[PDB]
Design a protein around this ligand. Sequence first.
Ligand code: HEC
Length: 104
Amino acid sequence: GDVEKGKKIFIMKCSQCHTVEKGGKHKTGPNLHGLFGRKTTQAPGYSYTAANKNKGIIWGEDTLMEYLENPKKYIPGTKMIFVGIKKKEERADLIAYLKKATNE
Ligand code: HEC
């Protein structure tokens, strides 16, 4: 998990909809601080879909590896309009970046 490659992926593919800093503002998508070890639909103040609430999983490496390959397939009906990342390494590198940036 290369975080520098993952940071560069996050800017290209997520940064327009997401922030990672603690106390970062909600944008189109929720602020991602505290993502790891947290159930879905748990960012305070963000309006999720009923689909995201119906999932009810714990966000970690394995659930993020499968979600980011195809979000519509993992959480059907989600309003996150992202096609997905096909390459293992980009998802693994991006998750390595998320593990450091979202944990303050
Ligand atoms: C807008 C154009 C987005 C882009 C690009 C990315 N995301 Fe996203 N994300 C967006 C929305 C609107 C939502 C809410 C989904 C819903 O149904 O309510 C999300 C959600 C997530 C989540 C789940 C957060 C949670 O369950 O608490 C994660 C983990 C997430 N987004 C990550 C993520 C990554 C890693 C992205 C790029 C690689 C990315 N998102 C792109 C909006 C948008």
